[PDB]
Amino acid sequence: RFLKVKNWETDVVLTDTLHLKSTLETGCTEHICMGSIMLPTKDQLFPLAKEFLDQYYSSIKRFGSKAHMDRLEEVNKEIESTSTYQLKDTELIYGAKHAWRNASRCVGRIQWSKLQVFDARDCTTAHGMFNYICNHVKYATNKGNLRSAITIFPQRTDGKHDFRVWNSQLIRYAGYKQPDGSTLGDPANVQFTEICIQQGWKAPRGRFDVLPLLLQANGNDPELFQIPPELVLEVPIRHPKFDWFKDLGLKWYGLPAVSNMLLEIGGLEFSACPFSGWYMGTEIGVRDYCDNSRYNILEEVAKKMDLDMRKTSSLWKDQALVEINIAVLYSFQSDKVTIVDHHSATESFIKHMENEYRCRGGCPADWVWIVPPMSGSITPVFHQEMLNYRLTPSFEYQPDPWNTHVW
Amino acid sequence: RFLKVKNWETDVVLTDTLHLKSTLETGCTEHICMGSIMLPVRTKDQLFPLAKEFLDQYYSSIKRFGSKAHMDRLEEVNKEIESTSTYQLKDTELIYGAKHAWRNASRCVGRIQWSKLQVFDARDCTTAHGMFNYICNHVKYATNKGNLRSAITIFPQRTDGKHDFRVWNSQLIRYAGYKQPDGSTLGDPANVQFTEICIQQGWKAPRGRFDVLPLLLQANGNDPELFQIPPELVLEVPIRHPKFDWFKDLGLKWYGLPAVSNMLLEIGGLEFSACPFSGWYMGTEIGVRDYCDNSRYNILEEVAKKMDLDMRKTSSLWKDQALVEINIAVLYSFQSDKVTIVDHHSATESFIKHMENEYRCRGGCPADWVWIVPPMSGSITPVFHQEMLNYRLTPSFEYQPDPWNTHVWKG
Ligand code: HEM
Ligand code: HEM
Ligand SMILES: N#Cc1ccc(CCNCc2ccc3ccc(N)nc3c2)cc1
Ligand SMILES: N#Cc1ccc(CCNCc2ccc3ccc(N)nc3c2)cc1
Numbered sequence: 170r171f172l173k174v175k176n177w178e179t180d181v182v183l184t185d186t187l188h189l190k191s192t193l194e195t196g197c198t199e200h201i202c203m204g205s206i207m208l209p210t211k212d213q214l215f216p217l218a219k220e221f222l223d224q225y226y227s228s229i230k231r232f233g234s235k236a237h238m239d240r241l242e243e244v245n246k247e248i249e250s251t252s253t254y255q256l257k258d259t260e261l262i263y264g265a266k267h268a269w270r271n272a273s274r275c276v277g278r279i280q281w282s283k284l285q286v287f288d289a290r291d292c293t294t295a296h297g298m299f300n301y302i303c304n305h306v307k308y309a310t311n312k313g314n315l316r317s318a319i320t321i322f323p324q325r326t327d328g329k330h331d332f333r334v335w336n337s338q339l340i341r342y343a344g345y346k347q348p349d350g351s352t353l354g355d356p357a358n359v360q361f362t363e364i365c366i367q368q369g370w371k372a373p374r375g376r377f378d379v380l381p382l383l384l385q386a387n388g389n390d391p392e393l394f395q396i397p398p399e400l401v402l403e404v405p406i407r408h409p410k411f412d413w414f415k416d417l418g419l420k421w422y423g424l425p426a427v428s429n430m431l432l433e434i435g436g437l438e439f440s441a442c443p444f445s446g447w448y449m450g451t452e453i454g455v456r457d458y459c460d461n462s463r464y465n466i467l468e469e470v471a472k473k474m475d476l477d478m479r480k481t482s483s484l485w486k487d488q489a490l491v492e493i494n495i496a497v498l499y500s501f502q503s504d505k506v507t508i509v510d511h512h513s514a515t516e517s518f519i520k521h522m523e524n525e526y527r528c529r530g531g532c533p534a535d536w537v538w539i540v541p542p543m544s545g546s547i548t549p550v551f552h553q554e555m556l557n558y559r560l561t562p563s564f565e566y567q568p569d570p571w572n573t574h575v576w
Numbered sequence: 577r578f579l580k581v582k583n584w585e586t587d588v589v590l591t592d593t594l595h596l597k598s599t600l601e602t603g604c605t606e607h608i609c610m611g612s613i614m615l616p617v618r619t620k621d622q623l624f625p626l627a628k629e630f631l632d633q634y635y636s637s638i639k640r641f642g643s644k645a646h647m648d649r650l651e652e653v654n655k656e657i658e659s660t661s662t663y664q665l666k667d668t669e670l671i672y673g674a675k676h677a678w679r680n681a682s683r684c685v686g687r688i689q690w691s692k693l694q695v696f697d698a699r700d701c702t703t704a705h706g707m708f709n710y711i712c713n714h715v716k717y718a719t720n721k722g723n724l725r726s727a728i729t730i731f732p733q734r735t736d737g738k739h740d741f742r743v744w745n746s747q748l749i750r751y752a753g754y755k756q757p758d759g760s761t762l763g764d765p766a767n768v769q770f771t772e773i774c775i776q777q778g779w780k781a782p783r784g785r786f787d788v789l790p791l792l793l794q795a796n797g798n799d800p801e802l803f804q805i806p807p808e809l810v811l812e813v814p815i816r817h818p819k820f821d822w823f824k825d826l827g828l829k830w831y832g833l834p835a836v837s838n839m840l841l842e843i844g845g846l847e848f849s850a851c852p853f854s855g856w857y858m859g860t861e862i863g864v865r866d867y868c869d870n871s872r873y874n875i876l877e878e879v880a881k882k883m884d885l886d887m888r889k890t891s892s893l894w895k896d897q898a899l900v901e902i903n904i905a906v907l908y909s910f911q912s913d914k915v916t917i918v919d920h921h922s923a924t925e926s927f928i929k930h931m932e933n934e935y936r937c938r939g940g941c942p943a944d945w946v947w948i949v950p951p952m953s954g955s956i957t958p959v960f961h962q963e964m965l966n967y968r969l970t971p972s973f974e975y976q977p978d979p980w981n982t983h984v985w986k987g
């Protein structure tokens with residue numbers, strides 16, 4: 170019941186007690202581990218509120234205070250009357266930071282306490298949402314000196330008045346299916362790119378077209394908005410040794426801003442809560458650029474390097490993968506946009522784990538997601554045992570709004 | 577209860593029914609996943625169901641389930657258990673058992689080969705010298721002058737746990753490690769503890785960077801004895817790089833035959849505590865882990881210097897760059913010397929096919945993603961994108977404590 174985790178490179182052992190706080194379920198059982206599976210009312214509401222307020226008031230050293238009981242009382246009365254309740258600004262901020270803190274798949278969590286929270290609960294319209302989102306983007310981008318941020322739209326009520334951002338990220342490239350049978354642009358976004366077209370977007374049908382925003386307010390139908398291009402910071406990708414690399418025509422955007430997740434705090438659900446930090450290089454260089462069902466550029470790059478692609482054993486894919494990832498880091502650094510390599514990031518996370526075990530009693534971590542998609546065992550996290558479990562407040566996945574939406 | 581796994585690169589969806597035949601525990605609960613944890617004297621009471629379960633499986637596989645020979649065998653085993661407190665496996669059952677233990681090894685990427693396994697029955701063995709002889713033969717057969725053949729040699733099963741056969745080496749062939757007075761380590765740091773034991777037992781260490789360890793063999797619960805594998809049986813490969821001529825001067829080599837000797841083989845409730853087995857290497861085992869783990873030979877820096885990479889910033893990915901060339905060199909050297917080896921692309925691609933085949937013919941394939949995914953270039957291999965389900969089937973290979981921690985010394 171008190172669990173130990175070992176780092177096999179350093180022999181450092183940490184003891185986990187935080188997992189006993191855990192509430193939600195993992196998908197695993199005594200008979201079967203599902204560690205690699207991608208996706209495993211008033212009476213309900215009050216204990217959830219209570220649990221949250223308990224940890225909030227504990228966090229500020231007023232556990233068992235009059236203010237605690239008063240707030241508990243006040244929220245309790247409000248649930249009985251209104252069937253929901255509203256978070257104080259302080260509670261909202263604490264909740265959002267802690268959702269990030271609890272995100273077991275996030276390697277960047279050492280930054281968790283430095284998050285700018287934008288309260289957009291006064292928003293009533295998609296135009297309003299757009300304004301809030303442009304402000305988020307400009308603030309977080311900060312001319313390339315990225316600052317982590319979250320914008321929080323009104324909470325779910327009866328689920329027929331949901332605020333949703335239909336985009337998966339605020340900034341993403343379109344995907345079009347060709348008559349050639351192939352795919353131009355980002356294959357991951359073909360379906361959404363269609364829905365933008367079905368709703369009226371004029372696609373430029375290019376390789377790297379910034380998608381328009383599809384914004385849903387108060388359960389109404391979604392609307393299109395173009396992010397001012399001046400607010401979309403992008404980085405042309407060159408290699409510091411290969412002059413021909415610039416001719417590949419690649420670029421990426423500086424701001425990773427996930428917009429389709431569900432934020433849960435004290436039993437309350439925020440279905441529209443776009444957040445942003447900054448990239449780890451492998452996200453673009455390894456996954457975005459080299460995944461087969463994505464931009465899939467390995468072959469072309471390999472050819473330009475004139476590698477022996479006859480046999481897999483030449484490790485040409487591995488060679489190319491490295492150089493591509495060099496270029497990404499080099500380009501972002503050269504243009505002064507915040508980015509972190511997989512070595513620096515995983516090393517930070519180890520320090521963060523140690524901080525969390527020391528100061529909190531543990532840290533939930535999904536090894537399958539924390540270990541980078543390249544050079545796994547030369548990063549310290551590979552050798553680090555981790556315990557995965559679900560703490561609240563949390564970020565959760567939710568269905569895509571088109572499968573749900575009653576038009 | 578049906579269970580679906582998804583490949584997110586191909587959208588291929590597979591349905592697992594095999595997990596229903598699972599008994600052993602994962603270490604996981606509904607409240608916690610221990611998927612990345614490295615490591616999460618039996619009574620006749622608990623022994624017969626295990627025998628029956630095994631024999632039921634065996635006789636199904638040969639399509640004689642419920643036959644008179646099936647029934648008689650259960651009867652025979654039953655009586656032999658209640659008379660002698662244990663039972664002996666037929667040769668056929670032993671072979672079936674060994675192959676299925678490999679087939680069930682969720683952490684093994686090489687399982688496409690599971691049905692090709694040369695089983696050596698060493699259950700008539702009684703002494704350490706006898707173990708040495710069996711092991712020498714295993715090494716010669718499996719090596720086959722570079723054309724490696726998978727094999728396992730199986731020594732007598734545990735009885736009262738006081739007469740265990742154990743091979744004290746973690747692998748039949750492995751390099752010594754020597755801790756120096758200055759804190760540095762000469763040779764393989766992973767083997768410092770075992771090296772020290774050998775030396776204590778009388779081994780005269782050459783004290784070099786690549787000294788092949790002696791065998792330390794324990795028969796029938798007696799104190800272990802030292803033997804030297806004939807050098808002419810130990811196939812080694814000098815590591816050079818196809819374009820970098822200085823790479824040879826690093827002085828690296830490795831042995832050809834990966835042969836794990838410290839695991840426990842469970843078949844029908846019986847425990848085989850000495851069952852060394854061997855296949856062939858995936859390149860990354862040597863080029864990534866053995867050479868590049870900070871706690872192993874740790875050659876990244878010296879290699880990086882020789883390539884003249886920017887080693888001042890990690891964001892140059894000098895480590896990633898040097899890792900690739902080293903792994904190229906390992907593969908190149910083995911292929912050049914015609915010693916069997918497989919790259920991580922080939923191996924993982926084969927595993928996917930094996931896994932799909934297992935789902936179709938067997939109803940599932942238990943697999944440990946954390947272990948199956950190679951330690952470099954993870955997502956450019958197809959296994960990264962494959963959801964897997966991990967669970968325990970018997971027969972199986974299990975870990976067991978190191979014998980020096982448990983052994984009762986005779987003197
Ligand atoms: C500031 C620098 C940050 C870095 C370097 C970073 C790094 C990462 C990386 C590499 C992943 C894996 C994502 C993937 O492979 O698709 C991830 C996941 C995640 N991150 Fe972070 N992150 C940062 C900031 C943030 C912030 C500000 C939040 C929220 C407030 C956050 C919440 C999450 C969540 C919930 C996941 C899980 C993603 C999922 O389940 O789909 N991260 N992070
Ligand atoms: C024929 C070529 C083979 C290849 C390429 C191969 C590949 C591998 C690799 C790369 C690992 C991971 C080991 C590590 O990283 O420490 C592994 C694990 C394992 N293999 Fe295979 N293998 C082969 C044959 C065999 C055979 C013949 C057996 C037994 C009859 C076997 C049983 C196992 C078991 C039980 C593990 C788990 C290791 C552990 O838990 O420590 N493999 N294999
Ligand atoms: N199909 C699919 C499919 C693929 C990936 C994911 C998870 C994507 N998470 C992206 C994500 C989330 C948060 C992040 C925070 C920071 C950062 N640099 N990248 C981040 C990236 C889900 C479904
Ligand atoms: N400390 C430690 C520690 C390090 C490694 C392991 C597991 C090692 N597994 C080695 C292993 C086992 C079976 C194999 C089969 C074939 C092959 N090529 N390599 C194989 C390699 C456990 C504890």
Ligand SMILES: C[C@H](O)[C@H](O)[C@H]1CNc2nc(N)[nH]c(=O)c2N1
Pocket residue numbers: 204205206207537538539584960961962963964
């Ligand atoms: C099948 C497997 O769960 C899937 O490919 C996971 C593996 N680990 C990952 N890790 C990160 N960081 N991001 C991912 O998308 C994935 N995908």
Ligand SMILES: C[C@H](O)[C@H](O)[C@H]1CNc2nc(N)[nH]c(=O)c2N1
Pocket residue numbers: 177551552553554555611612613614946947948
């Ligand atoms: C802590 C973690 O489970 C440990 O480093 C594992 C990770 N995956 C592995 N995978 C393989 N094949 N071999 C290993 O030794 C390990 N080590």
Ligand SMILES: [Zn+2]
Pocket residue numbers: 197198201202203204604608609610611
């Ligand atoms: Zn699990």
